[PDB]
Amino acid sequence: MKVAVLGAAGGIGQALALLLKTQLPSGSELSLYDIAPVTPGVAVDLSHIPTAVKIKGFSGEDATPALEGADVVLISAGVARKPGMDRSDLFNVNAGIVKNLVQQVAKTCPKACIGIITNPVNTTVAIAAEVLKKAGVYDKNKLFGVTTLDIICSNTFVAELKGKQPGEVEVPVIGGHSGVTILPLLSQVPGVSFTEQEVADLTKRIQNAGTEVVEAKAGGGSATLSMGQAAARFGLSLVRALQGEQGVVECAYVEGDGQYARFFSQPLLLGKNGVEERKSIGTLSAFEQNALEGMLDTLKKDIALGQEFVNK
Amino acid sequence: MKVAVLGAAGGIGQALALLLKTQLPSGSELSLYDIAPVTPGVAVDLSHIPTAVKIKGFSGEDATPALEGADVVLISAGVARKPGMDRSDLFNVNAGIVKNLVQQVAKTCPKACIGIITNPVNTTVAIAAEVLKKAGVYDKNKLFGVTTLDIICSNTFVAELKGKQPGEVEVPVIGGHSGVTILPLLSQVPGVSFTEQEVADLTKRIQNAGTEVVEAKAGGGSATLSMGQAAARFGLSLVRALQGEQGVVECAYVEGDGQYARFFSQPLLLGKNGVEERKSIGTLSAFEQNALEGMLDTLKKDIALGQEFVNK
Ligand SMILES: NC(=O)c1ccc[n+]([C@@H]2O[C@H](COP(=O)([O-])OP(=O)(O)OC[C@H]3O[C@@H](n4cnc5c(N)ncnc54)[C@H](O)[C@@H]3O)[C@@H](O)[C@H]2O)c1
Ligand SMILES: NC(=O)c1ccc[n+]([C@@H]2O[C@H](COP(=O)([O-])OP(=O)(O)OC[C@H]3O[C@@H](n4cnc5c(N)ncnc54)[C@H](O)[C@@H]3O)[C@@H](O)[C@H]2O)c1
The ligand minimizing its distance to the Cα of A234 is 1
CA dist B82 and B265 (Å) reads 29
- Residue B265: name the closest of B142, B113, B121 by CA: B121
Indicate yes or no: CB of A49 within 8 angstroms of CB of B152. yes
Indicate yes or no: CB of A229 within 8 angstroms of CB of B40. no
Packing angle of the helix pair B39-47, B11-23 (nearest 10 deg): 30
Task: Tell me the shortest Cα–Cα distance from A161 to chain B, in angstroms.
Answer: 13
CA dist B135 and B124 (Å) reads 17
Residue B157 amino acid letter:
F
Q: Does B27 touch chain A (CB under 8 A)?
A: no
C-beta of residue B209 within 8 angstroms of C-beta of residue B200: no
Packing angle of the helix pair A148-162, A225-242 (nearest 10 deg): 110
Which residues of B carry out catalysis? 177
3-class DSSP state for residue A174? strand
Task: Tell me the shortest Cα–Cα distance from A134 to chain B, in angstroms.
Answer: 37
The interface residues of chain B toward chain A in range 35-74, judged by CB-CB distance below 8 A, are 36-38, 40-52
The ligand minimizing its distance to the Cα of A10 is 1
Measured from the CA of B61, which atom of ligand 2 is nearest?
A: 32
Q: What stretch of H or E contains A309? A: helix A296-311
Alpha-carbon distances of B261 from A2, B58, B125, B176, B278, rounded to whole Å: 48, 37, 13, 10, 14
Ligand 1 centroid from CA A34, angstroms: 10
* Domain architecture of chain B: domains with CATH: 1-146 (3.40.50.720), 147-312 (3.90.110.10)
Q: Does B18 touch chain A (CB under 8 A)?
A: yes
Write down the experimental method used for this entry.
X-ray
What ranges in chain B are assigned the alpha helix state H?
11-23, 39-47, 64-67, 87-108, 121-134, 148-161, 196-207, 209-215, 225-242, 286-309
Indicate yes or no: CB of B50 within 8 angstroms of CB of A152. yes
Task: Tell me the shortest Cα–Cα distance from B139 to chain A, in angstroms.
Answer: 32
Report, in this order, helix, strand and coil percent for chain B, each rounded to 5. 50, 15, 35
Bridge-partner residues for A271, per DSSP?
A: A274
Resolution in A: 2.5
Bridge-partner residues for B182, per DSSP?
A: B175
CA dist B67 and B109 (Å) reads 6
Written as one string, the DSSP assignment of A243-277 is TT-S-EEEEEEEE--TTS-SEEEEEEEEETTEEEE
3-class DSSP state for residue B81? coil
